[PDB]
């Protein structure tokens, strides 16, 4: 729906339901600025936008080296359901360096909200974070406003000059509420269940981040559930065309317990070239080649030479949920791999 919510620095630390009223806190802020603002703004004008040049730093070896984000980039995260997803999302909030985090949970169960709120309660970031949510027992309309409230909230801190990270968990549940609305209103399913309206409403939502000439950015990570194929779920093909790339979490890698379960084969930052230097571009392309050739101890046979590179590769890609690496560390460690 078309609507107004609360924004401001008073909301830092807050949990916000799909109306706009705080229902819990993971932190207490000393500021109490609380303006009332529209939930459905338009994207910035092409004349208002900065170019994407400086990286968004996550702290996660495998994205900061091979899928570097740009401040103001809009990134997909494609994952089947589970922890994998929320393991990666917890790290982005932990080991990135954004000024503010706005997190929008859509359509999950109540336990899934509580888990995020407990995560937040134990994050040093907790004072820089806002959480909007809509569980599955709320209505289609309310699930769509969660997305809008959370963007709306991220938008305020952007005109106040902050570098903002935005997370929408399940775009595919945004979009499904979006359609149950359109079908309630009485509209004809075009594409595979979905009124043509939802796919013209999508660019408007997704182009409201990121970076502005006046200073202010919203880098936006957006989740997409993988349940069936590009024929059966139209979203993935559409979301792919509108966003600036995508991290693919792998079931195969997860089912072996490689975490984070990122298939760099299937992932791309579309702003890579323009946010990392030519040093990087090369070393990164190196490593990908390496990965390709590993496909082709235990413990004393001179096969040893194999196992010890698999194990620096596997050691580089794996990361402990508590550890953030900075550019240098990441870049050093990747150098130490291809020599």
Bind-site residues for ATP: 82-87
Nearer to Mg ion, 15 or 177 (CB): 177
Per CB under 5 A, does 103 bind Mg ion?
A: no
- Distance of alpha carbon 204 from alpha carbon 190, whole angstroms: 19
Task: Specify whether the CB–CB gap between 217 and 50 falls below 8 A.
Answer: yes
In the block, residue with structure tokens 């919203």: 218
Per CB under 5 A, does 163 bind Mg ion?
A: yes
- Distance of alpha carbon 195 from alpha carbon 198, whole angstroms: 6
- Distance of alpha carbon 339 from alpha carbon 322, whole angstroms: 28
What mask, x for binding Mg ion by CB under 5 A, covers residues 26 to 55? ------------------------------
Binding residue (CB under 5 A) for Mg ion from 155, 179, 287, 337: 155
Per CB under 5 A, does 75 bind Mg ion?
A: no
Binding residue (CB under 5 A) for Mg ion from 1, 31, 136, 303: 1
Name the minimum Å distance from CB 2 to Mg ion: 8
- Distance of alpha carbon 261 from alpha carbon 314, whole angstroms: 11
Per CB under 5 A, does 258 bind Mg ion?
A: no
- Distance of alpha carbon 23 from alpha carbon 57, whole angstroms: 31
What tokens were used for 280?
């990087």
Per CB under 5 A, does 233 bind Mg ion?
A: yes
What tokens were used for 241?
């065309």
**β pairing state of 14-16 and 55-56:** unpaired
Binding residue (CB under 5 A) for Mg ion from 87, 253, 313, 327: 87
SS3 107: coil
- What backbone phi and psi angles, to 5 degrees, belong to 103? -125, 130
Per CB under 5 A, does 243 bind Mg ion?
A: yes
Note the residues at the interface with Mg ion (CB under 5 A). 1, 57-58, 60-62, 64, 66, 68-69, 71, 77, 79-80, 82, 84-85, 87, 89-91, 97, 141, 144, 151, 155, 158-159, 163, 172, 205, 207-208, 217, 219, 221, 225, 230, 233-237, 240, 242-243, 245-246, 249, 251, 264, 319, 321
């Amino acid at each position: 729906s078309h609507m107004h919510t609360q924004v401001g620095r008073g909301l830092l630390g807050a949990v916000v339901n799909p109306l706009g009223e705080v229902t819990d806190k993971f932190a207490v802020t000393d500021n109490s600025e609380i303006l009332y603002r529209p939930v459905d703004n338009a994207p910035p004008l092409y004349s208002e936008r900065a170019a994407i040049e400086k990286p968004f730093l996550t702290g996660i070896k495998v994205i900061d080296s091979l899928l570097t984000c740009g401040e103001g980039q809009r990134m997909g995260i494609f994952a089947s359901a589970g922890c994998g997803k929320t393991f990666l999302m917890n790290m982005l909030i932990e080991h990135s360096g954004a000024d503010i985090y706005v997190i929008g949970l859509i359509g999950e169960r109540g336990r899934e909200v509580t888990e995020t709120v407990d995560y937040l309660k134990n994050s040093e970031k907790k004072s820089r974070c806002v959480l909007v949510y809509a569980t599955s027992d709320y209505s289609s309309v309310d699930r769509c406003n969660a997305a809008y409230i959370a963007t709306a909230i991220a938008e305020f801190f952007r005109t106040e000059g902050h570098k903002v990270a935005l997370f929408i968990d399940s775009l595919t549940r945004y979009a499904r509420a979006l359609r149950d609305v359109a079908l309630a209103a009485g509209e004809s399913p075009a594409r595979r269940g979905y009124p043509v309206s939802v796919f013209d409403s999508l660019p408007r939502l997704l182009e409201r981040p990121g970076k502005l000439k006046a200073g202010g950015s919203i880098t936006a990570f957006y989740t997409v559930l993988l349940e069936d194929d590009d024929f059966a779920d139209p979203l993935a093909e559409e979301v792919r065309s509108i966003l600036d790339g995508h991290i693919y979490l792998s079931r195969n890698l997860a089912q072996k317990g490689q975490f984070p379960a990122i298939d760099s084969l299937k992932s791309i930052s579309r702003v890579f070239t323009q946010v990392v230097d030519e040093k990087h571009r090369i070393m990164a392309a190196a490593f990908r080649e390496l990965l390709s050739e590993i496909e082709e101890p235990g413990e004393n046979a001179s096969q040893d030479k194999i196992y010890n590179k698999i194990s620096v590769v596997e050691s580089f890609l794996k990361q402990d949920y508590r550890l953030g690496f900075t550019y240098e560390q990441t870049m050093e460690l990747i150098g130490e791999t291809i020599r």
